[PDB]
Amino acid sequence: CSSDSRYKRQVSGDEAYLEAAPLAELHAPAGMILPVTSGDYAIPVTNGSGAVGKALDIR
Amino acid sequence: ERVVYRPDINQGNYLTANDVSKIRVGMTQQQVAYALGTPLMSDPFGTNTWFYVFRQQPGHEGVTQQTLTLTFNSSGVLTNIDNKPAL
Amino acid sequence: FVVKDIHFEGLQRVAVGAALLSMPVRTGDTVNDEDISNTIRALFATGNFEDVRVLRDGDTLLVQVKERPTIASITFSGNKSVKDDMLKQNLEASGVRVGESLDRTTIADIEKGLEDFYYSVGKYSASVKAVVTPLPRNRVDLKLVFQEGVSAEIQQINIVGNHAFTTDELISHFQLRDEVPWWNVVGDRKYQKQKLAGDLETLRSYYLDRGYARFNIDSTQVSLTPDKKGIYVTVNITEGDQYKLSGVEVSGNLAGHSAEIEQLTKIEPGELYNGTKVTKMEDDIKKLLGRYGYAYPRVQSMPEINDADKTVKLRVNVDAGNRFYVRKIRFEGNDTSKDAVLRREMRQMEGAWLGSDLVDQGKERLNRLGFFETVDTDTQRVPGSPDQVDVVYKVKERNTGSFNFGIGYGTESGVSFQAGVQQDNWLGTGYAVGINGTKNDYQTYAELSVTNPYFTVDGVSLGGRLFYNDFQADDADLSDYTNKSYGTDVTLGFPINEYNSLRAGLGYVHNSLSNMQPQVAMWRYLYSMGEHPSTSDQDNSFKTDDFTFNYGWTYNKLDRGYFPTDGSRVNLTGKVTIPGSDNEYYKVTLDTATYVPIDDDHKWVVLGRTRWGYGDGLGGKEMPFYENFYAGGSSTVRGFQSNTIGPKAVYFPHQASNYDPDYDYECATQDGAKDLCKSDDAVGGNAMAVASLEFITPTPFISDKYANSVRTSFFWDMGTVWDTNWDSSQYSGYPDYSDPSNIRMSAGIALQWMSPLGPLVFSYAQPFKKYDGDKAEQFQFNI
Amino acid sequence: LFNSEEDVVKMSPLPTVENQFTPTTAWSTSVGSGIGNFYSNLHPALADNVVYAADRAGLVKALNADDGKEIWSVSLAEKDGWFSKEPALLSGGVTVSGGHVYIGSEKAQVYALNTSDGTVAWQTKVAGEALSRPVVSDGLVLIHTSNGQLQALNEADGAVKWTVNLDMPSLSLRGESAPTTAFGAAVVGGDNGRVSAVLMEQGQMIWQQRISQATGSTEIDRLSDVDTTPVVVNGVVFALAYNGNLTALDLRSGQIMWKRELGSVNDFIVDGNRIYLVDQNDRVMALTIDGGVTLWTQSDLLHRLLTSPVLYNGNLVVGDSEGYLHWINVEDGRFVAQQKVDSSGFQTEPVAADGKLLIQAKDGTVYSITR
Amino acid sequence: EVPDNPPNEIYATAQQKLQDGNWRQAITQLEALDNRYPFGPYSQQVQLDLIYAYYKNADLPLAQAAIDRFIRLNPTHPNIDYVMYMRGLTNMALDDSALQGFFGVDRSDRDPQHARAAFSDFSKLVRGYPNSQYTTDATKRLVFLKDRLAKYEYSVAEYYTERGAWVAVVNRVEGMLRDYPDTQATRDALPLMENAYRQMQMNAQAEKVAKIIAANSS
C-alpha cells in the first residue's frame, strides 16, 4: 500500500498543546504594572471536560 | 574594533529643537500631540513621560544619541522637557 | 375555503414548509381560488417549479408540481479556447449552476449574456446554445453548444483632428498591432479595446510630453466592419497646440524641505511642457518627504495653462505627514524560515522616522533572498496618531530541496555511483546544506558545503568546505596515475555596502600524485615546479600541500535570488597562494549574470552569463594544471561534452606506463600509440573567455499558473580558453592554444522545469563551430 | 496535413448559378484597385457617358461609358498631411452634382472635382470621414459622417452651412443615415435604429422616432451595417432601423403607417408596391409597402455578400462581393441569369445608368454589365 | 465521485469508510451525499462526519470549508462546540508543521497567523461553550498557544535587541507584556526592556523594570 519509516504513514494529532506551556504571572510592584492582558487573551478554564487531546474524538 | 566601516545603525523618533521649543512645561499631551503626535515610547506604568530618543552609529567613530523625554503629569499637563545628549 | 391539508407533491430541493411559506395559504389559512392561483404563481416564484397545479379536495388543498432544481451537469461543448469557467462565470452570474434552480425561461438570457460575454472578449462572432437535458428525479443537464465563429483583430485606425503626429506613427507606439507580412513577422495583430484604452493614454501622454496641454481626444469611433473581424477606428482629437512649462509655483505644507523640493522642481521656465515629468516630479517630493518621515505627503500640482503665450504655469500644492510614522513593522509568510531572519533583511528600523526606500531596500533583500515566492507587504496606516504606521510584510515563500545525478550502471557493474543532495533554508533556519560525493571503481569522493549564514549578524556566512577526493583511476591503478586529493576551506561573508558583500577564506589541498602520465603539459608544470620528472615513463610521485587564500565579493542588484528578470550581479572569485604553500601561484576567475528586459513586460529578458579567468604563478612555480580553465558539456557552452574548450595535451615518446594494459589506456604507453601522440579533450588553459547568452521565452501551451516557474531559453554559446604559456614554439606540430581566439561554439535551448525538487534542466544544442575538435553530445541533461 | 490545424464556423455559400437569359458585360475596364475589401462607402456615379469612378488609394478616372476609355483622370491621392503623396482613401461615394464630383474622404475631407477634368473645384475638411455618401443637394453637401454629423456644405465653393449631430452611439455603428431629401425636409434615419425628419433648409428636426435596436444591451452584430437612409414615397417614410427593422411612417410627423420590427435587411428598395430587399441572410424577398406582406421571396442567395437590388435588363438584378451577379425574377425570385464578372466582388452599388449596369469592383475594378 | 445512489446507501458506505478511516472514499460518499442530498436528516451529521473525515485526512481548509458549511447549514446545533473547537483545531493545524521535529527544530516562531486564528476560536469555544468535551482540551491549547505566540514575539523581541533600535526592543516587550501577562518569554523580555533603556541611557526607567524583575524573580 504505502511506506514511511517502515510504517505506512503518519497522521496529524497533538497532545503538546494539551501540555499547556507554563505561565508565570507578574508579581510586578505597584505603579510598575502594565495592562498585561490585552487582545483575545481570555481563557475561561471550562469543563465539560470529556476526552482531551488526541483522546478527544471529533464529531 | 579594528574595523572602520560598519553598516550604519540608526534609531530615529526624536523631537528636534524646534519641537522642544514648540512645546512647554504646562502643555497637555494633546497640546504636544497636535503638533508632535504620539511618542514611540512613553511610561508604561507611571506618568505620561513622552520619550523621543534618537540613536545612530556610523563608522567606529562612536555612537550618537539624543534622548528626549516629555514628562507630562498624571493629568497630562507637561512638567518636564528633558532632552539628554549621547551617553 | 379554509385548507385542512395541502398535498405537497414534487419539491425535491425546497422543503414542504419552504413550499408552505411560498404558498400564500398555509395549512389552516382561509383559501380563495384567488389564493389558490396565488399559490400557483408564488410557487412559480420559487424559481424551482416547472409547473404548479394548486387544486383542492373541497377545501383540502393539493399542489401538483414537477420541478426545475438541482442541475446535475452543465455540459460545455464548443468551449475550445475560452475557458469553461469564464463561460460558467456568466452562468454563475445568472444565478444558475450545477445543483441550482433551473429556469427554462432564462436559457437564451444566459446565452445572450454569454454573447454579451463574447461582446466583451474581442468578438461577437461566437454563439452559445444551452440545452436543458432532464436527469433523474428533478435533475437536468445543461448542454451548452457553443457556435464560436471568430475573434476580432486590429485592422486600421483613422485619427482625424490629429495633425501633429502621424497616425501609424502613433500605432507603432500602440499595443494595437497590425503588421505581420508572410515574410516579416514581428508577432501577431490580435485585438483588445483595453489595449485601445491604454493606447488612448499612450496617445494622451504623446501630446502632453511635448507641450500640447489643451490637447484633447474628442471622440473615438471604432468600426462595426461587416466581417466580424474588422477594426476600423475613427478617432476624433483636438491636437491642442503646445505649451511651455513657464514656471513652477510649488506650495502648501512644504514641511521645511522646500529647497530640496525646489530641487525636484528645478525646471526651465519656457521649456516645452512635459506633464509626465510633472507627474513624475510630484512623486519626487513624495519619496523625499517619504524619506523625510512623512509617509503621506499629499502633493497636488496644477499646470495653469497660459494660452496667451502658449505656456503653462505649474502650481503645485504639497502637504506632508509627520516624521515618526514608523512605529513598528509586522511580518507574514514567515511561517517556515525564522521571522527574525526576515526581520534582519530590512533596512527601515522601528522607533524611527521613515526613510521610504529602506522598506523597498529591505524588500529587495527579501527579493534577493530566493527562498521566497513573492516579496510584498502591507503598509497600512494604523489609526490614532501621525506617528502611527505599521508595515505588515506579508510575503510568500518557495520550495527548496534539489538533486543532481550521476551513474555509470547499477547492479551489473561494481559499487559505482555519484551522489549529491541539497537542503537549503535547512529546516527553516536559512542554512544551506549542499553535500555530494561519489564512490566508484575509479575513485572515492567526499565533500561538504554547509553554511551558517548568520552565525554572526553582520553578514557572517559561516560557510565551511571540506573535500576528500580519493581519486584513483581504478582500472590499472598505478599505471592510471593515482592521485588522492583532500583539503579544507572555510569562507565568510560581510556586507561591505548594502548591496555589496565580500567573501574570503583559506584554501588547502593535499594532492598525492603517483606515476604521472607522459603528457607534455603534465611534466611542464612539474618542470616549472623545479621537478624534472621523466617523460618516457610513468614513474614519478608527488605531494603538494598548497596553502592559498581564496576570496570573493558579491555585487547584488539583480531581481530574484531564485528566478530574476531584471538587473545584474557581479561575483568575482579567486585565490592566491600564501607563504607556507608548496607552490607560489594565484588563480582568479570572473562570474557574470545580468538580466536586461527585451520585453518591457520582461516576458523576454536577455540572460547574460559569461565566465572569465586567469591564474598563473607568483613567480617560479606555476599555477597547477588542475587549476586550468575549461568549458564544454554542462557549462557555458553546451551541446558539447565536458572539457572541450582549452588546450589539448600532447604525450611523449614513452613506453613504461607501469603497463597501461594490453592496448588499453593509451597515453603513448608501450602498448601501442607510442612516440608523441596528442589527446583531444581540453586539458585547458590558464586563461578563460567564455560567454553564454540566453533569453526568457514564454510558451503558449503551458499555463502561466505553472509556466512562470519554467524558463525556456535559447542560446548561441561560444567561448575561448587558452594557455598563455602553451607556446607555439613548444606547440607547432600539434595545435597551439595561446591565441586569445579559440572559438568553439554550440547553439540551442535549455529545458528548465521546476519540480518539487526545484528546477531540473535538460538541453539540446547544435554545434556548428569546433575550434581544434570537440566531443559533442547534442542532447544535454544537466539537472 | 492541414486536416488538424484549427477551426471556425461561418456562412452558407451561393446556390443556383443560372443562365436562362445568359448575361454579359457592356464593356470591361478598371479604375485601379478600388473600393476593396476595406469597408468603405465609396461607389461610382454613372452619368453623361462618363464613368465617374475612383480607386480608393488614388486616381479619379473619368472613363467613357462605352468602353471604359479614360475621359479624364486626376488623383485624389493626398499630396499633404504628415506626408506628401498619401493615398486617396475616400469614405463617401462619387457625387456628381452639376460641374463637380463631390467625394467624402477618409481624410475627413469633402471635395468637388470639376467634372470636365477632375480638378478639385473646391475642397473642404469635414467632421470625420463621410460614413454616408454626401447627398449634394440644395447647395448643401448633406453627409452622414462617422460621428453622425448632418453637415451642409456649400456645393459651389465649400462653406459649412450647419453641422448637426445625427443619430448613432458612441462607437461608430457603421451604417448609413444618408440625408436624402423629401418635401423640403432633411429625412434621416439613425444608426441607433431611430428614424427622423430634419429641416432640409437649416437642419431643424421635424421629428425623430425610434424604430428598433442598436448595439448595447440588445446587442446586434459587427456585420450590422444597415442603411437607415429612407426611401420616402412622398409622405410615407420607408426606412430600416439599424438592425434592419423596416417601417412606414408619416413624413412630416413620423406616424407609423406600418412597421416591420422583424426586419433583417442589408439593402432595401421600394419597387412599386413591392419592397424588394437584400436580407442580412441575403434572402431576396418582396414585401409590401402597405405592410410587410411577402409578395415573393428567394432564398436562392443565402448568406452572401450581396450588393443592392436593382432592376435592369428586364430583371431584378443583385450582385455580390463574391463577384457573382444574378438576374432575379421581378416576380418570385428566380435567377434568370448569373454573371460571374468578378470574384473579388463589389462593395459599390449596381448603377443601372446609361443603359448599363455600372459597378466598380472591389479590386478587379470597373465593369459594366448587360445581358 | 459517487453516482446518483440512495442517500442512506451513500451514508452507510460513508459510515464504512469513516469507520475504515477511508476519508478519501468517505468524503467521496459524504460530499456526493450532500452534493445531491444536503437536505438529508444527517446532512448536519454528514458535515459533522465531513470535518471528522477532512481533518483526519488533514484537509484543514476543506474541513474549514465544511465547518463554514456546517456554520451555514447548522448555525443552531449542539456540535458547534465541536465546530468552534474545530474552528480553532483546524487553525491549530493550519499554523505550523514540518519534518524537522524528529531532528530537533521547532516552529513556534514562524506562524502567528493561524496560531491566533486557533486562539480566537478555541477561546470562542471556551467562552461560548463551557459544556463540551472540547472546552477543557482547547483551554490547555490556549494556555500553550499564549506562550507559543510569546515564543514567536519574543523571537521578534530578541531580534530588535540585536538590531539596535532600542525603542523597537521595549515596544516588543510591552507587546510581550500587555498581551502575555505570564509567559516566560515575556519574563525574559523583562531583562531586554531595561537593558535597551540602558542603551538609550534611560537607566532610571530601566530600574523600574528591575523592581519588576525583583518582583518577577519570583
PDB file of N, CA, C and O in Angstrom, chain B residues 5-15 19 33 35-40 52-54, chain C residues 322-327 347 349-353 385-388 458 494-498:
ATOM      1  N   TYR B   5      34.573  50.486   8.576  1.00  0.00           N
ATOM      2  CA  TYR B   5      33.198  50.563   8.104  1.00  0.00           C
ATOM      3  C   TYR B   5      32.325  49.694   8.995  1.00  0.00           C
ATOM      4  O   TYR B   5      32.703  48.573   9.349  1.00  0.00           O
ATOM      5  N   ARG B   6      31.170  50.210   9.349  1.00  0.00           N
ATOM      6  CA  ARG B   6      30.090  49.361   9.814  1.00  0.00           C
ATOM      7  C   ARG B   6      28.866  49.696   8.980  1.00  0.00           C
ATOM      8  O   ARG B   6      28.711  50.849   8.561  1.00  0.00           O
ATOM      9  N   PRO B   7      28.025  48.712   8.658  1.00  0.00           N
ATOM     10  CA  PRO B   7      26.704  49.027   8.097  1.00  0.00           C
ATOM     11  C   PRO B   7      25.922  49.863   9.095  1.00  0.00           C
ATOM     12  O   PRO B   7      25.684  49.441  10.228  1.00  0.00           O
ATOM     13  N   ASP B   8      25.568  51.075   8.670  1.00  0.00           N
ATOM     14  CA  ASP B   8      25.192  52.160   9.569  1.00  0.00           C
ATOM     15  C   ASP B   8      23.905  51.876  10.328  1.00  0.00           C
ATOM     16  O   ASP B   8      22.893  51.489   9.737  1.00  0.00           O
ATOM     17  N   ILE B   9      23.948  52.060  11.642  1.00  0.00           N
ATOM     18  CA  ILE B   9      22.828  51.753  12.519  1.00  0.00           C
ATOM     19  C   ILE B   9      22.234  53.066  12.990  1.00  0.00           C
ATOM     20  O   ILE B   9      22.962  53.938  13.468  1.00  0.00           O
ATOM     21  N   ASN B  10      20.918  53.211  12.845  1.00  0.00           N
ATOM     22  CA  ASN B  10      20.220  54.404  13.298  1.00  0.00           C
ATOM     23  C   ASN B  10      19.059  54.010  14.199  1.00  0.00           C
ATOM     24  O   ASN B  10      18.621  52.856  14.204  1.00  0.00           O
ATOM     25  N   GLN B  11      18.567  54.974  14.964  1.00  0.00           N
ATOM     26  CA  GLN B  11      17.283  54.877  15.637  1.00  0.00           C
ATOM     27  C   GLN B  11      16.735  56.290  15.723  1.00  0.00           C
ATOM     28  O   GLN B  11      17.305  57.135  16.416  1.00  0.00           O
ATOM     29  N   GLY B  12      15.674  56.569  14.988  1.00  0.00           N
ATOM     30  CA  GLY B  12      15.122  57.907  14.883  1.00  0.00           C
ATOM     31  C   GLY B  12      14.235  58.236  16.061  1.00  0.00           C
ATOM     32  O   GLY B  12      14.637  58.063  17.217  1.00  0.00           O
ATOM     33  N   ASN B  13      13.018  58.708  15.753  1.00  0.00           N
ATOM     34  CA  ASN B  13      11.994  59.082  16.729  1.00  0.00           C
ATOM     35  C   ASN B  13      12.522  60.119  17.705  1.00  0.00           C
ATOM     36  O   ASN B  13      12.859  59.794  18.846  1.00  0.00           O
ATOM     37  N   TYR B  14      12.726  61.338  17.236  1.00  0.00           N
ATOM     38  CA  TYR B  14      13.288  62.340  18.120  1.00  0.00           C
ATOM     39  C   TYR B  14      12.648  63.684  17.823  1.00  0.00           C
ATOM     40  O   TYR B  14      12.524  64.089  16.665  1.00  0.00           O
ATOM     41  N   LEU B  15      12.247  64.367  18.890  1.00  0.00           N
ATOM     42  CA  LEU B  15      11.692  65.711  18.805  1.00  0.00           C
ATOM     43  C   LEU B  15      12.840  66.695  18.684  1.00  0.00           C
ATOM     44  O   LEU B  15      13.565  66.925  19.654  1.00  0.00           O
ATOM     45  N   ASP B  19      10.871  71.222  17.919  1.00  0.00           N
ATOM     46  CA  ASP B  19       9.808  70.516  18.620  1.00  0.00           C
ATOM     47  C   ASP B  19       9.935  70.674  20.126  1.00  0.00           C
ATOM     48  O   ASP B  19       8.931  70.608  20.841  1.00  0.00           O
ATOM     49  N   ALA B  33       0.495  66.613  21.176  1.00  0.00           N
ATOM     50  CA  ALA B  33       0.017  65.655  20.182  1.00  0.00           C
ATOM     51  C   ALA B  33      -0.626  66.337  18.983  1.00  0.00           C
ATOM     52  O   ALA B  33      -0.794  65.701  17.937  1.00  0.00           O
ATOM     53  N   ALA B  35       0.863  68.764  17.451  1.00  0.00           N
ATOM     54  CA  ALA B  35       1.991  69.042  16.581  1.00  0.00           C
ATOM     55  C   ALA B  35       2.843  67.795  16.418  1.00  0.00           C
ATOM     56  O   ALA B  35       3.226  67.433  15.302  1.00  0.00           O
ATOM     57  N   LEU B  36       3.133  67.125  17.530  1.00  0.00           N
ATOM     58  CA  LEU B  36       4.149  66.086  17.564  1.00  0.00           C
ATOM     59  C   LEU B  36       3.563  64.694  17.730  1.00  0.00           C
ATOM     60  O   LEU B  36       4.324  63.727  17.827  1.00  0.00           O
ATOM     61  N   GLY B  37       2.236  64.576  17.747  1.00  0.00           N
ATOM     62  CA  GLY B  37       1.554  63.297  17.731  1.00  0.00           C
ATOM     63  C   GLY B  37       1.826  62.431  18.939  1.00  0.00           C
ATOM     64  O   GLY B  37       1.813  62.912  20.070  1.00  0.00           O
ATOM     65  N   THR B  38       2.096  61.170  18.711  1.00  0.00           N
ATOM     66  CA  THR B  38       2.418  60.277  19.806  1.00  0.00           C
ATOM     67  C   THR B  38       3.928  60.217  19.976  1.00  0.00           C
ATOM     68  O   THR B  38       4.677  60.688  19.115  1.00  0.00           O
ATOM     69  N   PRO B  39       4.427  59.704  21.098  1.00  0.00           N
ATOM     70  CA  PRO B  39       5.780  59.162  21.088  1.00  0.00           C
ATOM     71  C   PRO B  39       5.729  57.695  20.712  1.00  0.00           C
ATOM     72  O   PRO B  39       4.696  57.030  20.793  1.00  0.00           O
ATOM     73  N   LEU B  40       6.875  57.172  20.311  1.00  0.00           N
ATOM     74  CA  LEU B  40       7.001  55.744  20.068  1.00  0.00           C
ATOM     75  C   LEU B  40       7.467  55.047  21.346  1.00  0.00           C
ATOM     76  O   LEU B  40       7.703  53.839  21.372  1.00  0.00           O
ATOM     77  N   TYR B  52      11.306  60.450  23.289  1.00  0.00           N
ATOM     78  CA  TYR B  52      11.669  60.553  21.874  1.00  0.00           C
ATOM     79  C   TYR B  52      13.192  60.468  21.796  1.00  0.00           C
ATOM     80  O   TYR B  52      13.884  61.484  21.831  1.00  0.00           O
ATOM     81  N   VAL B  53      13.717  59.257  21.635  1.00  0.00           N
ATOM     82  CA  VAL B  53      15.143  59.001  21.803  1.00  0.00           C
ATOM     83  C   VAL B  53      15.776  58.669  20.460  1.00  0.00           C
ATOM     84  O   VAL B  53      15.499  57.612  19.880  1.00  0.00           O
ATOM     85  N   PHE B  54      16.656  59.548  19.995  1.00  0.00           N
ATOM     86  CA  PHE B  54      17.476  59.301  18.822  1.00  0.00           C
ATOM     87  C   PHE B  54      18.664  58.420  19.189  1.00  0.00           C
ATOM     88  O   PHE B  54      19.170  58.502  20.309  1.00  0.00           O
TER      89      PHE B  54
ATOM     90  N   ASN C 322       3.692  63.431   9.184  1.00  0.00           N
ATOM     91  CA  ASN C 322       4.613  63.685  10.287  1.00  0.00           C
ATOM     92  C   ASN C 322       5.737  62.662  10.206  1.00  0.00           C
ATOM     93  O   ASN C 322       5.703  61.763   9.365  1.00  0.00           O
ATOM     94  N   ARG C 323       6.769  62.839  11.029  1.00  0.00           N
ATOM     95  CA  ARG C 323       8.003  62.088  10.838  1.00  0.00           C
ATOM     96  C   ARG C 323       7.878  60.645  11.301  1.00  0.00           C
ATOM     97  O   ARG C 323       8.137  59.715  10.532  1.00  0.00           O
ATOM     98  N   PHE C 324       7.415  60.432  12.531  1.00  0.00           N
ATOM     99  CA  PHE C 324       7.700  59.191  13.258  1.00  0.00           C
ATOM    100  C   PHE C 324       6.698  58.094  12.939  1.00  0.00           C
ATOM    101  O   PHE C 324       6.392  57.283  13.823  1.00  0.00           O
ATOM    102  N   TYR C 325       6.157  58.101  11.712  1.00  0.00           N
ATOM    103  CA  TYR C 325       5.208  57.099  11.228  1.00  0.00           C
ATOM    104  C   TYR C 325       5.687  55.671  11.459  1.00  0.00           C
ATOM    105  O   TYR C 325       4.888  54.810  11.837  1.00  0.00           O
ATOM    106  N   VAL C 326       6.989  55.412  11.320  1.00  0.00           N
ATOM    107  CA  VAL C 326       7.492  54.053  11.515  1.00  0.00           C
ATOM    108  C   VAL C 326       7.469  53.781  13.011  1.00  0.00           C
ATOM    109  O   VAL C 326       8.392  54.114  13.755  1.00  0.00           O
ATOM    110  N   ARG C 327       6.376  53.175  13.442  1.00  0.00           N
ATOM    111  CA  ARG C 327       6.174  52.787  14.819  1.00  0.00           C
ATOM    112  C   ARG C 327       6.852  51.448  15.030  1.00  0.00           C
ATOM    113  O   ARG C 327       7.868  51.358  15.725  1.00  0.00           O
ATOM    114  N   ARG C 347      15.684  47.323   6.227  1.00  0.00           N
ATOM    115  CA  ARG C 347      16.575  48.459   6.405  1.00  0.00           C
ATOM    116  C   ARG C 347      15.936  49.677   7.060  1.00  0.00           C
ATOM    117  O   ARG C 347      16.667  50.593   7.448  1.00  0.00           O
ATOM    118  N   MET C 349      14.226  50.968  10.359  1.00  0.00           N
ATOM    119  CA  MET C 349      14.109  50.499  11.730  1.00  0.00           C
ATOM    120  C   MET C 349      12.877  51.090  12.408  1.00  0.00           C
ATOM    121  O   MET C 349      12.432  52.199  12.098  1.00  0.00           O
ATOM    122  N   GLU C 350      12.311  50.314  13.326  1.00  0.00           N
ATOM    123  CA  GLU C 350      11.186  50.770  14.120  1.00  0.00           C
ATOM    124  C   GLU C 350      11.674  51.749  15.174  1.00  0.00           C
ATOM    125  O   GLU C 350      12.857  51.775  15.525  1.00  0.00           O
ATOM    126  N   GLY C 351      10.745  52.540  15.694  1.00  0.00           N
ATOM    127  CA  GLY C 351      11.118  53.580  16.625  1.00  0.00           C
ATOM    128  C   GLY C 351      11.886  54.671  15.922  1.00  0.00           C
ATOM    129  O   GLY C 351      12.923  55.135  16.406  1.00  0.00           O
ATOM    130  N   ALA C 352      11.392  55.067  14.754  1.00  0.00           N
ATOM    131  CA  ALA C 352      12.128  55.998  13.921  1.00  0.00           C
ATOM    132  C   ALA C 352      11.165  56.756  13.027  1.00  0.00           C
ATOM    133  O   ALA C 352      10.006  56.373  12.855  1.00  0.00           O
ATOM    134  N   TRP C 353      11.673  57.845  12.464  1.00  0.00           N
ATOM    135  CA  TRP C 353      11.032  58.450  11.311  1.00  0.00           C
ATOM    136  C   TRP C 353      11.270  57.578  10.084  1.00  0.00           C
ATOM    137  O   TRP C 353      12.136  56.700  10.075  1.00  0.00           O
ATOM    138  N   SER C 385      -2.503  58.351  15.397  1.00  0.00           N
ATOM    139  CA  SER C 385      -1.553  59.446  15.542  1.00  0.00           C
ATOM    140  C   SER C 385      -0.808  59.615  14.230  1.00  0.00           C
ATOM    141  O   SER C 385      -0.804  58.690  13.408  1.00  0.00           O
ATOM    142  N   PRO C 386      -0.163  60.779  13.993  1.00  0.00           N
ATOM    143  CA  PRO C 386       0.628  60.915  12.766  1.00  0.00           C
ATOM    144  C   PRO C 386       2.029  60.338  12.910  1.00  0.00           C
ATOM    145  O   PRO C 386       2.938  60.643  12.134  1.00  0.00           O
ATOM    146  N   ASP C 387       2.220  59.519  13.935  1.00  0.00           N
ATOM    147  CA  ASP C 387       3.415  58.713  14.087  1.00  0.00           C
ATOM    148  C   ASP C 387       3.067  57.235  14.174  1.00  0.00           C
ATOM    149  O   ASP C 387       3.732  56.478  14.889  1.00  0.00           O
ATOM    150  N   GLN C 388       2.030  56.818  13.454  1.00  0.00           N
ATOM    151  CA  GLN C 388       1.412  55.514  13.645  1.00  0.00           C
ATOM    152  C   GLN C 388       1.265  54.856  12.288  1.00  0.00           C
ATOM    153  O   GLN C 388       0.213  54.945  11.663  1.00  0.00           O
ATOM    154  N   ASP C 458      26.464  40.169  11.280  1.00  0.00           N
ATOM    155  CA  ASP C 458      26.992  41.144  10.334  1.00  0.00           C
ATOM    156  C   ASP C 458      27.331  40.473   9.007  1.00  0.00           C
ATOM    157  O   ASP C 458      28.476  40.525   8.547  1.00  0.00           O
ATOM    158  N   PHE C 494      30.314  39.332   4.587  1.00  0.00           N
ATOM    159  CA  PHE C 494      30.099  40.614   5.242  1.00  0.00           C
ATOM    160  C   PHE C 494      29.545  41.605   4.230  1.00  0.00           C
ATOM    161  O   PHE C 494      30.109  41.732   3.136  1.00  0.00           O
ATOM    162  N   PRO C 495      28.489  42.356   4.557  1.00  0.00           N
ATOM    163  CA  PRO C 495      28.028  43.388   3.625  1.00  0.00           C
ATOM    164  C   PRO C 495      28.918  44.613   3.681  1.00  0.00           C
ATOM    165  O   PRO C 495      28.816  45.431   4.601  1.00  0.00           O
ATOM    166  N   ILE C 496      29.786  44.754   2.678  1.00  0.00           N
ATOM    167  CA  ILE C 496      30.668  45.907   2.575  1.00  0.00           C
ATOM    168  C   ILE C 496      29.913  47.155   2.150  1.00  0.00           C
ATOM    169  O   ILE C 496      30.260  48.268   2.566  1.00  0.00           O
ATOM    170  N   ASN C 497      28.872  46.998   1.350  1.00  0.00           N
ATOM    171  CA  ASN C 497      27.834  48.001   1.249  1.00  0.00           C
ATOM    172  C   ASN C 497      26.548  47.231   1.449  1.00  0.00           C
ATOM    173  O   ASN C 497      26.585  46.067   1.856  1.00  0.00           O
ATOM    174  N   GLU C 498      25.407  47.845   1.191  1.00  0.00           N
ATOM    175  CA  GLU C 498      24.157  47.181   1.500  1.00  0.00           C
ATOM    176  C   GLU C 498      23.583  46.486   0.274  1.00  0.00           C
ATOM    177  O   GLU C 498      22.438  46.027   0.294  1.00  0.00           O
TER     178      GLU C 498
END
